[PDB]
Amino acid sequence: GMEPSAKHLQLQTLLSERHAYLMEGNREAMHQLLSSDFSFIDGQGRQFDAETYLDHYVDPDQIQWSNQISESMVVEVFETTALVQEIVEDHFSYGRSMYIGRFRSVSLYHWANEGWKWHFHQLTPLDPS
């Protein structure tokens, strides 16, 4: 009777779909992942809502991603929330220049109505490799 937790699997699926959507600049699909009170804090401490996050990080006329390498990750699932810690190396173009930056990031996902959404994200800058 013992089977993989559908709750834990659906989180791994969202973390994949989100990455695909970021690489690809898929604004419609990325919005669908975001909780209605979503917020994102970048490594300078600037706060984005759903709409402005999407404008800056997920619109292929401004930003073109080549990679986000996940060096490291810890996932903890609670009852209604999950907390993810990650060290990422981001690679993207912005205005025909190309940028690299590493971060220690934390996110929270919210499990409601049998589905997960991305609710909060925050970046803390790390030194380059």
Place this chain on the structure above:
Amino acid sequence: GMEPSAKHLQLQTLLSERHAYLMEGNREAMHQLLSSDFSFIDGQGRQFDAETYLDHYVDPDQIQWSNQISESMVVEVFETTALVQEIVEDHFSYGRSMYIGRFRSVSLYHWANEGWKWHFHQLTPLDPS
């Protein structure tokens, strides 16, 4: 029959007791607030466990706090967790010099066995006032 939620009140009490313990350098009382897998990420991305967090931030032979001003805060309580966002201005002495620094911080608290514990914290540096 309608009464203040004991769950939401006990979180406000922990956020107070923690502050008192930080100002005062109360290592025994601060340890009691920490979850058993506690971690703390500072604004450079360095990771502390319970023991090393306490050594660096809560031992009055190394650090002497004069203040942590909470400029701003959002609390969201879920079923088993709470997520707190805060802008803090920290003021402390370390080796007879005196330091100021502002941060955008996020924390997670874990509600188990009818009690809250501080489970995760992360800092992202902000510019001075």
